[PDB]
Design a protein around this ligand. Sequence first.
Ligand SMILES: *[C@@H]1O[C@H](CO)[C@@H](O[C@@H]2O[C@H](CO)[C@@H](O)[C@H](O)[C@@H]2O)[C@H](O)[C@H]1NC(C)=O
Ligand SMILES: *[C@@H]1O[C@H](CO)[C@@H](O[C@@H]2O[C@H](CO)[C@@H](O)[C@H](O)[C@@H]2O)[C@H](O)[C@H]1NC(C)=O
Ligand SMILES: *[C@@H]1O[C@H](CO)[C@@H](O[C@@H]2O[C@H](CO)[C@@H](O)[C@H](O)[C@@H]2O)[C@H](O)[C@H]1NC(C)=O
Ligand SMILES: *[C@@H]1O[C@H](CO)[C@@H](O[C@@H]2O[C@H](CO)[C@@H](O)[C@H](O)[C@@H]2O)[C@H](O)[C@H]1NC(C)=O
Ligand SMILES: *[C@@H]1O[C@H](CO)[C@@H](O[C@@H]2O[C@H](CO)[C@@H](O)[C@H](O)[C@@H]2O)[C@H](O)[C@H]1NC(C)=O
Ligand SMILES: *[C@@H]1O[C@H](CO)[C@@H](O)[C@H](O)[C@H]1NC(C)=O
Ligand SMILES: *[C@@H]1O[C@H](CO)[C@@H](O)[C@H](O)[C@H]1NC(C)=O
Ligand SMILES: *[C@@H]1O[C@H](CO)[C@@H](O)[C@H](O)[C@H]1NC(C)=O
Ligand SMILES: *[C@@H]1O[C@H](CO)[C@@H](O)[C@H](O)[C@H]1NC(C)=O
Ligand SMILES: *[C@@H]1O[C@H](CO)[C@@H](O)[C@H](O)[C@H]1NC(C)=O
Ligand SMILES: *[C@@H]1O[C@H](CO)[C@@H](O)[C@H](O)[C@H]1NC(C)=O
Ligand SMILES: *[C@@H]1O[C@H](CO)[C@@H](O)[C@H](O)[C@H]1NC(C)=O
Ligand SMILES: *[C@@H]1O[C@H](CO)[C@@H](O)[C@H](O)[C@H]1NC(C)=O
Ligand SMILES: *[C@@H]1O[C@H](CO)[C@@H](O)[C@H](O)[C@H]1NC(C)=O
Ligand SMILES: *[C@@H]1O[C@H](CO)[C@@H](O)[C@H](O)[C@H]1NC(C)=O
Lengths: 177, 338, 48, 343, 182, 48
Amino acid sequence: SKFGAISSVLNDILSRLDPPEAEVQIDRLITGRLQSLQTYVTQQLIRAAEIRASANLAATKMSECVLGQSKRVDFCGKGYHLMSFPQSAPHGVVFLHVTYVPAQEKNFTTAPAICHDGKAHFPREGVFVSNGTHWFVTQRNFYEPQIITTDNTFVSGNCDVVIGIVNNTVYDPLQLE
Amino acid sequence: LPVSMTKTSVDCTMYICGDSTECSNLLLQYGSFCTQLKRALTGIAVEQDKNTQEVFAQVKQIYKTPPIKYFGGFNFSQILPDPSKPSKRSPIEDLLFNKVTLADAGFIKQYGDCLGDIAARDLICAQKFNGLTVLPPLLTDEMIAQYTSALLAGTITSGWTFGAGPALQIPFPMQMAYRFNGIGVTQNVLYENQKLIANQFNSAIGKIQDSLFSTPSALGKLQDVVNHNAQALNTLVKQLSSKFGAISSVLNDILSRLDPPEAEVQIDRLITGRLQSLQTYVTQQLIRAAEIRASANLAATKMSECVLGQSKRVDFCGKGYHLMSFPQSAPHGVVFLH
Amino acid sequence: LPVSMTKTSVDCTMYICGDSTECSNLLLQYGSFCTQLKRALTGIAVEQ
Amino acid sequence: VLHLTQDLFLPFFSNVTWFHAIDNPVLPFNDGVYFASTEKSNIIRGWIFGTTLDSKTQSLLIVNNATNVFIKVCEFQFCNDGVYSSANNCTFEYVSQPFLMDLEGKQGNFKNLREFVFKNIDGYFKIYSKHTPIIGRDFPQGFSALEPLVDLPIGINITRFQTLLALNRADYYVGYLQPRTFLLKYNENGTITDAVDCALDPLSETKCTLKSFTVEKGIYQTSNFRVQPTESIVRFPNVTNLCPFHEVFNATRFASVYAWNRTRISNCVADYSVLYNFAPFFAFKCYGVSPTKLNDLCFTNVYADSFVIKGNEVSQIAPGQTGNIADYNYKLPDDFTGCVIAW
Amino acid sequence: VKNKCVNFNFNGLTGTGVLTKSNKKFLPFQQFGRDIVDTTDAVRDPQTLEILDITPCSFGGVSVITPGTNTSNQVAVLYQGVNCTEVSVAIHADQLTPTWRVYSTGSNVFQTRAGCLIGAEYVNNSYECDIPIGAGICASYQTQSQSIIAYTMSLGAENSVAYSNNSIAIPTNFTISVTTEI
Amino acid sequence: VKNKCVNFNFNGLTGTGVLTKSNKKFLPFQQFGRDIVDTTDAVRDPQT
Ligand SMILES: *[C@@H]1O[C@H](CO)[C@@H](O[C@@H]2O[C@H](CO)[C@@H](O)[C@H](O)[C@@H]2O)[C@H](O)[C@H]1NC(C)=O
Ligand SMILES: *[C@@H]1O[C@H](CO)[C@@H](O[C@@H]2O[C@H](CO)[C@@H](O)[C@H](O)[C@@H]2O)[C@H](O)[C@H]1NC(C)=O
Ligand SMILES: *[C@@H]1O[C@H](CO)[C@@H](O[C@@H]2O[C@H](CO)[C@@H](O)[C@H](O)[C@@H]2O)[C@H](O)[C@H]1NC(C)=O
Ligand SMILES: *[C@@H]1O[C@H](CO)[C@@H](O[C@@H]2O[C@H](CO)[C@@H](O)[C@H](O)[C@@H]2O)[C@H](O)[C@H]1NC(C)=O
Ligand SMILES: *[C@@H]1O[C@H](CO)[C@@H](O[C@@H]2O[C@H](CO)[C@@H](O)[C@H](O)[C@@H]2O)[C@H](O)[C@H]1NC(C)=O
Ligand SMILES: *[C@@H]1O[C@H](CO)[C@@H](O)[C@H](O)[C@H]1NC(C)=O
Ligand SMILES: *[C@@H]1O[C@H](CO)[C@@H](O)[C@H](O)[C@H]1NC(C)=O
Ligand SMILES: *[C@@H]1O[C@H](CO)[C@@H](O)[C@H](O)[C@H]1NC(C)=O
Ligand SMILES: *[C@@H]1O[C@H](CO)[C@@H](O)[C@H](O)[C@H]1NC(C)=O
Ligand SMILES: *[C@@H]1O[C@H](CO)[C@@H](O)[C@H](O)[C@H]1NC(C)=O
Ligand SMILES: *[C@@H]1O[C@H](CO)[C@@H](O)[C@H](O)[C@H]1NC(C)=O
Ligand SMILES: *[C@@H]1O[C@H](CO)[C@@H](O)[C@H](O)[C@H]1NC(C)=O
Ligand SMILES: *[C@@H]1O[C@H](CO)[C@@H](O)[C@H](O)[C@H]1NC(C)=O
Ligand SMILES: *[C@@H]1O[C@H](CO)[C@@H](O)[C@H](O)[C@H]1NC(C)=O
Ligand SMILES: *[C@@H]1O[C@H](CO)[C@@H](O)[C@H](O)[C@H]1NC(C)=O
């Protein structure tokens, strides 16, 4: 770009104009070129800052999803996070998140607690689920029905505050033996 | 947290040379010192689009709330969208929209009333005079409310499951018991003090609306972003009133008053001044866009953590042992209810 | 981890035209170019 | 490379007038004209250029023959058909290799098509050409480049264009070039395999903005659209404030030259039509301004010195003059910025 | 000549745009009218003593939405931020600076909140976005036999949960999905 | 002189570079030539 001078090539300008009139045009060239360079360096600085932010995020993602398991949702891939393998890329990194996603689900029934004998029973882990006829306990992200024993539940209450409590019998392996 | 700002798409050719053929020819000597500016501004606009999409488009399926609203005594009408309002917005979002006044909405098509302004033209008509325009956002401020409603429906009827896989229904009482279980309190405690905790939640949801209403400016961050953009734009427009060391400030005056080869120096001075002003404006826009992008990434992580699950990290989702959050849409921002 | 940097309050007229009335007058012809700089420096101090 | 250049170029899918030959209208010349002609062997010899095509302005004649060409920038009188007559002022006779190249593969089916382009920017007549026996129906559809042949500095005035014929015992494809921005695709061997206009189609505008032939799916911001003002109004204050010019030129006792009345004209709008209609002038010479260029100028003060004088003394009255009036009665300063009026 | 873009040279001030009647209170001494940024807004008529505003003659930006050129050559034009009845009369009177004239069949008119789309038609269906237009509108290339259509965003497939007092959906099975993050 | 960085003044065009044989396809009307970004690259020998 001529930048408002005689020509955009100094080698031509000096071989065409003497110093005491060429210094003005060469100064115009200097100011234009250095303004363009200032624009370039500012844009490069901004791009480098953005890349640094992305690199810090990627470093945290490495040290979290690879060197351990992340409980954060939607951080190491969609769904529940299981593992992650890194892969090198040109001027970047690529992850392989392995995520646990549930599958076919069925309505059964639920009750906040079970009242066996005046006492409300609550599951130590999981919810109280009902086939429709027989109440059961299971895990949360997989259906594994189990018999309601004294081991699966902890008892604390008086069977008159829990709204929606449902009547059923609990079991124990100690009365039998 | 702000998520985005207004998208400006200035055109250097006319902003610097108002419909002047000779001025455009003179600017043509400055190389590709315009395509760079236009590319930067369109990149900023696309960046804003991706920020809002990253903040809000976290769930694919748009769930709807069940017709009956009895979540174990929890009162959600203040955050649930109101069908009576024609925009389908919650009462809280109503206050958020009312308490923010945008100088430039953008979606106005204001051409046609600048002539009919009757009074002195507004900032918008002034900007439309000297090569300034605003690109309206891709995601209309209405559909954003629909995304917010879908996210709110997912977190009150299906727990935190819908962000992992299929949305599995769960009543709010045992969802409450589980959010309690994730902190260190047994579910039985909730099942014993459900009425008390529901009254606490209702009182808090009542008090937050009054706190937002009576404050002078608690939405000061979004107001600050809007004011910063408007002030930068107004200064950028005002810069055309500086002679920059020439005879006059008006291109059509200098051209019609002086001969070409003498007015060339003055028009070159005007080019060097106005274009430097535009460069400074573009750089400030770049810095603001970088900061807003960082805030939008923080907001997206906050959404996916606090709203879409329980966050164990202290103080991240509000002060204290975090339980949940509800998202609420705002002009050029989001409002969280930890 | 750094937390803040030194706060700066550079001034347009005093930096550019040290006590020169003609120089300040010719700076006024440049419009409000530098009020932006003063506002930005106030901002950086505030964020520190 | 995909270089983009802005230079006078015939628009793509532009409108081209097609003539026949069995009388040779004078087609106007402005911003160049694209020329094409297909023939069996030859029916066309040359062209003539210039304005008014007579012995008053310089003209051009580029007739070819069997072995050479007769380019000349001369002032031919007329032919109306031994192509020039009445030599008065001819110059710059140019002779080189013949333009017309004709080749046949032992048959007349290989009718050569010839595309010629001419331009006159800052003089420097430019002639572009490419000869090839194309399909021969008419103007082809496949892209073809044009190689400049001669570039000669005529430095004259061209307004009208005409073509010459042959003797004997489907041509004239004429299109007008326009100033447009173009992009040309260059082969690795350097030949232009394709070119796209940048003022024809939205797709052309997009391809031009990114200087690329393949545009991926998406949106592209290309330019700005403007509703050009249909008319132009000029409105100024209602002030008339006619100058006392009327009373300085309707006077009945114009003072003598020895005592020249000097009237100070101030606080008025100097309209010169009241001056033009009041006196059938015989000497309205000006020195610092133009008689025509005065109604659009502002002045601080105006002096009207009026005196009746003889005939030769009118020519005497002028800056830097001498005589019994210019020395003893009224002397005009050499640096006079004004006008004199004699009737 | 009011309500028409026209070059004006009022008493020495020169500009471009539309002038019409106004209801200002120009004090008798007042001659010019401006605003916060001091842009000449209202001009008093020197030969009529009435008040007229000055308006940006036409301020928008042309954007072209196109599919891949290797797929099709059809294109559509976006006139950003303009009521496109204004361009429709502008196209008719042929005072538009753009020289490329894309066809107007009446069905290719689109009063979008983000400008006007020309060369495309409404489809009241809802498809996932392909090319973002703005104001919740997306264009895409589709078979009728092929053309360019414009349609509103579909935020996703419509789904309704089955929340009840005692209803739980518990997954009886699971799957492993391997995504990618770059 | 080929294969030696040397100050050239070909046809008044000044500069400093290494000249060498090139396999380009200059037209007889072509004189200077250039490269992608506007720098004189391949100047054909006016004599040979
Ligand atoms: C309740 O849950 C029971 C699981 O113990 C299911 O009972 C099964 O019934 C078969 C015969 O019907 C038995 O042979 C088997 O051992 C098991 O007990 C029962 O289907 C289920 N009820 C409903 C309505 O789902
Ligand atoms: C579960 O079974 C309890 C008895 O073991 C029921 O308590 C009864 O409640 C009735 C009133 O509803 C009393 O009249 C009676 O004396 C006894 O206390 C209890 O209601 C029952 N609950 C459900 C949900 O079935
Ligand atoms: C949930 O909370 C709402 C608060 O917005 C209650 O609405 C109230 O309705 C009364 C009139 O019935 C108004 O006077 C009051 O200002 C408020 O709008 C709503 O009733 C409540 N619902 C339940 C089931 O608690
Ligand atoms: C550029 O010019 C080269 C010199 O003729 C071409 O190379 C030739 O290609 C032909 C086949 O077309 C070979 O038979 C011959 O031996 C030589 O390699 C080259 O193709 C050409 N490139 C173009 C026109 O794109
Ligand atoms: C859980 O879902 C798996 C796939 O998502 C099932 O595996 C399938 O098993 C069938 C045969 O049963 C194969 O044909 C198929 O290729 C796939 O491996 C799996 O059976 C299922 N488990 C249950 C208990 O439903
Ligand atoms: C639960 O029951 C509702 C009742 O209509 C049904 O729509 C839903 O699909 C059921 N959920 C299942 C089967 O997982
Ligand atoms: C060429 O002329 C014909 C008939 O006069 C006209 O219809 C056509 O539009 C013209 N071409 C163009 C490109 O306008
Ligand atoms: C040159 O041409 C003019 C007419 O244009 C003619 O009057 C003049 O005589 C010619 N020159 C000669 C023959 O001296
Ligand atoms: C053609 O023009 C040239 C011009 O030098 C001339 O020598 C030659 O005699 C002319 N005629 C033929 C048939 O070559
Ligand atoms: C004087 O004015 C009258 C009235 O307009 C006009 O008819 C007449 O020609 C004028 N005479 C001179 C000498 O200006
Ligand atoms: C000049 O003109 C005025 C007009 O009123 C007249 O009074 C005066 O006597 C004139 N002077 C001479 C020298 O004639
Ligand atoms: C302007 O001058 C004309 C000429 O006499 C007159 O008819 C008109 O009323 C004037 N208008 C104003 C506003 O002065
Ligand atoms: C813009 O929209 C339509 C179409 O032109 C019309 O009502 C009028 O021109 C404008 N309306 C408003 C409210 O600006
Ligand atoms: C179909 O599209 C038209 C506009 O072309 C719209 O008015 C109408 O409401 C649409 N119908 C449905 C069912 O969406
Ligand atoms: C849940 O129970 C309450 C009262 O116990 C009742 O009002 C509501 O309709 C019930 N909802 C469902 C879905 O069963």
